[PDB]
Amino acid sequence: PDPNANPN
Amino acid sequence: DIQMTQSPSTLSASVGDRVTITCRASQSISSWLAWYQQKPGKAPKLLIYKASSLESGVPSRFSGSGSGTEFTLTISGLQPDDFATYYCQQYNSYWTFGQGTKVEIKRTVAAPSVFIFPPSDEQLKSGTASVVCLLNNFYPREAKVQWKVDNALQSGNSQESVTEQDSKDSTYSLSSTLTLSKADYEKHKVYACEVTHQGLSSPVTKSFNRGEC
Amino acid sequence: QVQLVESGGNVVQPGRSLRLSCTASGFTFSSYGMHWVRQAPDKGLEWVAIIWYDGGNKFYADSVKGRFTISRDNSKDTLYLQMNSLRAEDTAVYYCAKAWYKIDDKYSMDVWGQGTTVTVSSASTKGPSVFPLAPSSKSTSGGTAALGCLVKDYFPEPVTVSWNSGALTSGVHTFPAVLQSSGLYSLSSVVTVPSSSLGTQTYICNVNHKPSNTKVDKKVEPKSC
């Protein structure tokens, strides 16, 4: 999974 | 990890000047670059995102440009509120920051006043001797301080401390403290600190003889 | 508006644990990811961890992986950082930051809190020793004399220094503390006064170390050489 992807 | 480096580390400027800070990345981060501003004792504040997009509420004198590995932050018409440290940050792969660029107030070059303090008799009873060299009210901040004991250069037994820029005269002050045991302090005579600063035509020496004063 | 308040920072021995909190207000906390970022001179600005809005996806920096755990309680609008097996290099100011509401392929943080300070050391609490930095012929230039006090071997930070109980403030320079190899801090506070006032004016430095409940007054006597 991408850490910089949408976390909201 | 993507390494972020800023240039310069310290920028000297005046109100009204147009200044530019440079940020470089170890590998391409596309346009995923953010700029923040931090004042001493305060939190970072977002200024620019996506390299060029201004955050809402940030004045239009802040503008950004750049892509890939090289980026710039430009402040057009510096205001007193703009004197602070600015950090770039990549968010392409995790989050890494630059070391920071401090924007300071530029003033005329002022040479330091060099004073030396031998250890007190009260400290010597405790078994330690501290010699303090004081560089007072100098600009710019770059200065070289070396300790010589009986003409022998000292290494690894001194610590330096510098104040932030003074709010009234825009100067810096620095202290260098040579720490020795009581027994090692008592076997030498001449204790001297040598100061190199732009305001001085040549290195300046401030010395004392142990026990004379 | 958006408000983030950190708490929990304290002095902790190496190898022990500490729990930090970030209490949020002014935004719908349950809809945003949250970050922990730390700051120190040896580390600059260093990202620590991120947690997704629901508390499932968590990523950590290698420097803390296996020792720090990030969590959140959305019913309390509170973010947590559980720090285990703390090291001296973990000493820093710890900030909590909200992930921004900017829709794009990549995301970062916008709003930061005020920060809470974590100091990891094995040193015991100790009040400072105050030694005079006496004025002399070697501390004079143009009718102005420099004098000061050496505040040495105290733990932990901070100390406050005043001169003549606050009556003398102009020309004062209290330097930032340095950490000695013994683990104890030391600093000096100096002031420039007219040489002509050395015989007429008494000068005393006032050092307070609240962690040790230590208040010290030290008269600096002028030297006749």
Author numbering:
A (entry chain M): 8 to 15
B (entry chain B): 1 to 94, 96 to 214
C (entry chain A): 1 to 52, 52A, 53 to 82, 82A, 82B, 82C, 83 to 100, 100A, ...
The authors write:
IGHV3-33-encoded antibodies are prevalent in the human humoral response against the Plasmodium falciparum circumsporozoite protein (PfCSP). As the most abundant surface protein expressed by Pf sporozoites and with essential roles in parasite development and invasion, Pf circumsporozoite protein (PfCSP) is a major target for biomedical interventions. PfCSP is composed of three domains: an N-terminal domain that undergoes proteolytic cleavage prior to hepatocyte invasion; a polymorphic, T cell epitope-containing C-terminal domain; and a conserved central region largely composed of consecutive major NANP repeat motifs. In total, 22 antibody fragment (Fab)-antigen complex structures were solved at 1.54- to 2.95-Å resolution to gain insights into whether differences in potency are associated with different features of PfCSP repeat recognition.
